[PDB]
Structure formats: C-alpha cells, structure tokens
C-alpha cells in the first residue's frame, strides 16, 4: 500500500512522491513538515494524500531550489524557520499608525522594532521567501517574516536581542549593491586618508545618532596623539542608519525618518519605536502614543537619503 504526496523546499516546486505507509516520513524524506508541524516520526495517514510537505534538501534539485529560495547554504534553515513559525503564527500583528506592529510577547520588541523600521524604509529583499514574507507583513500577515528574521539571525523565539544586529543580518539579504559611502579622515600631519564602503557597511554607523555630526565631523583618536576629524564625503543610498550606545537624545520633527529607543541596562531592556510624520508617534507593541518631541535613551536613528556631496575641503599640512 502506497500514497501519493508532494515534497517541496520553496513552496513553488511540488515534487511528487509515492510514500510508503509502512515506514514513517523520517525514513524516506528525512525531517518533514506538514503546515509547520513536524511529522517526521509519525507514519503516513490516508488523510494526508495530495497535501504538500516541507523537507530538508536531500538532493541537487532540492538543494538548488532551497538555495534559490532562501539565499543560504545552511541546510538546517528550514528547521529553525518552522520552529520559530510555530510560535510567530500565534503573535498578533495590529496596524498602528499606518504600519504593522506586534503585540508584546516572547520579547519580540526588537522584532517589532525592525519590522516597523523596515516598513518605513525603501528596500528590496533579494531572497524570494524574505521578499514575499515582507510584502505579506506590510499587508498585515507578518508571522512568516518574523520566523524568517529569527531564522536568518540564528536567534530562537523568546531570546532577547539587538535591533542593530538583526538589521545587519537582514540587510545582508537586502539589495544594497549600489549603496555607496565614502568617508575621509584627517590628522595634524598624517594628512588626508579616505575610505570607501558598500552594501550593509555603507548604511550603518555605530558611534553617533546624529546624521549631521557625520557630515560635520567626528573626533576619533589617531596615531599621532591628536584627535582626528572623520566626516562623510559622499553617501549614495536610499537611507542611513545611525546607531550608538543607548543615550539620552532629543528627537525633533523634521530631522529624521524614524528611530529606536532602548530602556534598561545591558542585562535586560525594552525597545520602543519612534516614527515622525505630522507629530511624533511612539509605537510600543500594540500601544501608540502621539508626542511633540522625545527626550530619552535612544540607540538607533534612521535618516532618508538619495545622493549627498560635501562642502568640505582638506588642507595638506
């Protein structure tokens, strides 16, 4: 006695399989999943005929497809994905201030923050799965997106986390090929020393929340004792994330796009999101608070951008 089922890795290619009812799925396809449920150990029922099954890639076609789907070489991705999905499917994703958030549960504030942030950024995801889940998230269904975020970050549900790290791990799979940043360092006698950065490295900074301070100058310790001045020469990208250790900072109306606040210590803390349009909107999970201006311990500030050139000029000393 046999049954006809389908096995897939990308939810696009459904590979026909004549499953043996005597043996379990585990003994045939390996670790299997039916709608997020691990049925690797249970044997095939007649009920399950015609249904689609999610497997780990075990041959060249499945490996190729799975890679083309997830843009990762790690074959264990699906496992963590489903493991997270089983939980994210339960989270509630209300619409707050024209954006999809998440009800506080399982320390998801940083996920909620990166989600809210991403919805306000102009970005393309290169991984089909991630892009689809992103669109679905913007629509209102963001369980799969969260699960994928957890998967790509090697973080499990419930774990506390850093918004910046997650943002990095995500933007890895974002389309920032044309994103270009060039900076310049100047000392007293060490002259001018320029640097070029691309991709994720061209839209991330960790040292100051202010975008202007990057254009004006930043005091960085140099070789010859005296502090050198670092300043942004050129920034060709859609947006810029400026981060720093959690510090008291005053947010103003027309100075940025959105930002993240982190209240607490390096032991345990809570994230809150700030987005600016008419007034300033503070999103705390499912809760919303309108505001005139925010003075608090903020860690990440996002700025919109197109193409920027400088006024600055060096002086060969």
């Amino acid at each position: 006695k046999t049954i006809k089922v389908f096995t897939t890795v990308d939810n696009t290619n459904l590979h026909t399989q004549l499953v043996d009812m005597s043996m379990t799925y585990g003994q045939q396809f390996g670790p299997t999943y039916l709608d997020g449920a691990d049925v690797t150990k249970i044997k095939p029922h007649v009920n399950h005929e015609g249904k689609t099954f999610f497997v780990l890639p075990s041959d060249d076609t499945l490996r190729s497809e799975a890679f083309e789907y997830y843009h990762t070489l790690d074959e264990s991705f699906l496992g963590r994905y489903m493991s997270a999905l089983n939980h994210t499917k339960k989270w509630k994703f209300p619409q707050v201030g024209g954006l999809t958030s998440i009800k506080w549960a399982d320390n998801n504030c940083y996920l909620s923050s990166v989600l809210l942030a991403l919805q306000q950024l102009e970005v393309k995801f290169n991984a089909p799965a991630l892009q689809e889940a992103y669109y679905r998230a913007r629509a209102g269904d963001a369980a799969n997106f969260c699960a994928l975020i957890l998967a790509y970050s090697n973080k499990t549900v419930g774990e506390l986390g850093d918004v910046r790290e997650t943002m990095t791990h995500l933007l890895q799979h974002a389309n920032l090929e044309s994103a270009k940043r060039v900076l310049n360092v100047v000392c007293k006698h060490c002259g001018q020393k320029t640097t070029t950065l691309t991709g994720v490295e061209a839209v991330m900074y960790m040292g100051t929340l202010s975008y202007d301070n990057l254009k004006t100058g930043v005091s960085i310790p140099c070789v010859c004792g005296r502090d050198a001045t670092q300043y942004l020469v050129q920034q060709e990208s859609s947006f810029v994330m400026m981060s720093a250790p959690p510090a008291e900072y005053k947010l103003q109306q027309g100075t940025f796009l959105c930002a993240n606040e982190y209240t607490g210590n390096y032991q345990c803390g809570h994230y809150t999101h700030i987005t600016a349009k008419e007034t300033l909107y503070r999103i705390d999970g499912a809760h919303l608070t309108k505001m005139s201006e925010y003075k608090g311990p903020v860690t990440d500030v996002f700025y919109k951008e197109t193409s920027y050139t400088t006024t600055i000029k060096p002086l060969e000393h």
């Binding site: 320390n107 504030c109 940083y110 923050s113 506390l160 986390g161 850093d162 918004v163 910046r164 790290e165 990095t168 490295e201 991330m204 960790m206 040292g207 960085i220 310790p221 140099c222 070789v223 250790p245 959690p246 982190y262 607490g264 390096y266 032991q267 345990c268 803390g269 809570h270 994230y271 860690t299």
Partner: peptide
Amino acid sequence: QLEDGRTLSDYNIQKESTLHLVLRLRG
C-alpha cells in the same frame, strides 16, 4: 562594525590603531 570571520589585516587595522568596544543589547 567588525565581524569574527575576518582579521585585523583585512579590515586594515594598522599599528596603534584604536578600536571601540561595545556590547550587544538585550531587548
């Protein structure tokens, strides 16, 4: 940002350069 994979020579960290130490947030 610096990552575990690469080395000081890759990131072009020369003699008596100054790095900044920060900790991952636990939100």
